[PDB]
Design an enzyme around this catalytic site. Structure first.
Site, PDB file in Angstrom:
ATOM      1  CB  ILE A 133      -0.708  -0.598   1.452  1.00  0.00           C
ATOM      2  CG1 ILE A 133      -1.951  -1.180   1.406  1.00  0.00           C
ATOM      3  CG2 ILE A 133      -2.081   1.488   0.887  1.00  0.00           C
ATOM      4  CD1 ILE A 133      -2.701  -1.582   2.421  1.00  0.00           C
ATOM      5  CB  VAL A 162       1.364   0.727   5.029  1.00  0.00           C
ATOM      6  CG1 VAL A 162       0.266  -0.587   6.238  1.00  0.00           C
ATOM      7  CG2 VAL A 162       1.867   1.884   6.203  1.00  0.00           C
ATOM      8  CE  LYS A 167       1.937   2.689  12.810  1.00  0.00           C
ATOM      9  NZ  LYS A 167       0.916   2.463  12.918  1.00  0.00           N
ATOM     10  CG  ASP A 203       0.904  15.488  13.072  1.00  0.00           C
ATOM     11  OD1 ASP A 203       1.236  16.897  12.798  1.00  0.00           O
ATOM     12  OD2 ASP A 203       1.740  14.586  12.159  1.00  0.00           O
TER      13      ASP A 203
END
Length: 349
Positions: A22, A30, A45, A140
């Site tokens: 991905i 990932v 991941k 974040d």
């Protein structure tokens, strides 16, 4: 031997079949894969952090937080694959619920209905309330850190920059630099803040909300101070009493030195947005971090009354006071601490 994916080694062993690549990252990779014990495709991941002392702090922080949080709007950790010994461990694999997309991918392409905007914002606030109740700051929040599956269930990910809240040691000087994504930084980050208050996350959500109303970031500053210039471009000049809470003269005088600019009315920037939604956006994006609305107050705003339910908005049972001092720690105590916190997934446990 070890199965490969786009060249690199991705040995997630006999529970995870049918690798399907991905994405990448500074030390991520990932993949999609089949979870044979539970017969569901899952995300994995592969973190390879142990070379940079800064990547282990981001990795140990995420892992510690994620394992202790349990919340429908926060991504969980289903499994963790690593070698059985510290010295054979060169990678750590994190198994999460597979999530088809994220808000960044979706805002690039799909224009959201007002029902969708309202629903996604409720899900952000409901999971954020749980984060803040654990005395954690995400720091974040941006669209790419909001995952979504095909029935528009939203889940917050990547606690790599998270801190235990610390409002009594939040002050710093003017232009004190900062790690979190520029476009979502609160204005006080550039003036006198280290980003250690809950108000730092509300501003980011405000920014996410604005971007959901228009498929465009509201304050796309290109370098560190253009960010402050973009905010004041829309909010307008801070009021006298707003300036009267900035004691730092380097920050206060920078503000005084700018010519007067008028507030840009929200109904102007977002003329097909729900008026209830614009009024909450207003309270989320107030310049003064103390005037800014708290998470639980945002949940009880009229814009979200179709969803509001405090008995169905759970808070954390185990708050942190363990700011864990991870950044006074050598290469190895991070690696040994990442090793220890993953032990509960190794066979023979």
């Amino acid at each position: 031997g070890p199965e490969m994916v786009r060249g690199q080694v991705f040995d997630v062993g006999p529970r995870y079949t049918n690798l399907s690549y991905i994405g990448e990252g500074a030390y991520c990779m990932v993949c999609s894969a089949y979870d044979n014990v539970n017969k569901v495709r899952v995300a994995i991941k592969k973190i390879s952090p142990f070379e940079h002392q800064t990547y282990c702090q981001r990795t140990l922080r995420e892992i510690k937080i994620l394992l202790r949080f349990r919340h429908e709007n926060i991504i969980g950790i289903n499994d963790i694959i690593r070698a059985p010994t510290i010295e054979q461990m060169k990678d750590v694999y994190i198994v999460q619920d597979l999530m088809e997309t994220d808000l960044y991918k979706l805002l690039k392409t799909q224009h959201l209905s007002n029902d969708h905007i309202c629903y996604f914002l409720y899900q952000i606030l409901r999971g954020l309330k749980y984060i803040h109740s654990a005395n954690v700051l995400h720091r974040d929040l941006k669209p790419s850190n909001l995952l979504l599956n095909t029935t528009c269930d939203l889940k917050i990910c990547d606690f790599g920059l998270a801190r235990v809240a610390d409002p009594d040691h939040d002050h710093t000087g003017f232009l004190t630099e900062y790690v979190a994504t520029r476009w979502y930084r609160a204005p006080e980050i550039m003036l006198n803040s280290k980003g250690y208050t809950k108000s730092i996350d509300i501003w980011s959500v405000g920014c996410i909300l604005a971007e959901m109303l228009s498929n465009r970031p509201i304050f796309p500053g290109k370098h560190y101070l253009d960010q402050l210039n973009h905010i004041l471009g829309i909010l307008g000049s801070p009021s006298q009493e707003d300036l009267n809470c900035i004691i730092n003269l380097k920050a206060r005088n920078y503000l005084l030195s700018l010519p007067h600019k008028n507030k840009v009315p929200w109904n102007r920037l977002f003329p097909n947005a729900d008026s209830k939604a614009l009024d909450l956006l207003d309270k989320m994006l107030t310049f003064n971090p103390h005037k800014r609305i708290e998470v639980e107050q945002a949940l009880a705003h009229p814009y979200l009354e179709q969803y509001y339910d405090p008995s169905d908005e759970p808070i954390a049972e185990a708050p942190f006071k363990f700011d864990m001092e991870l950044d006074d720690l050598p290469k190895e105590k991070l690696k040994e601490l990442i090793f220890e916190e993953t032990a509960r997934f190794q066979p023979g446990y």
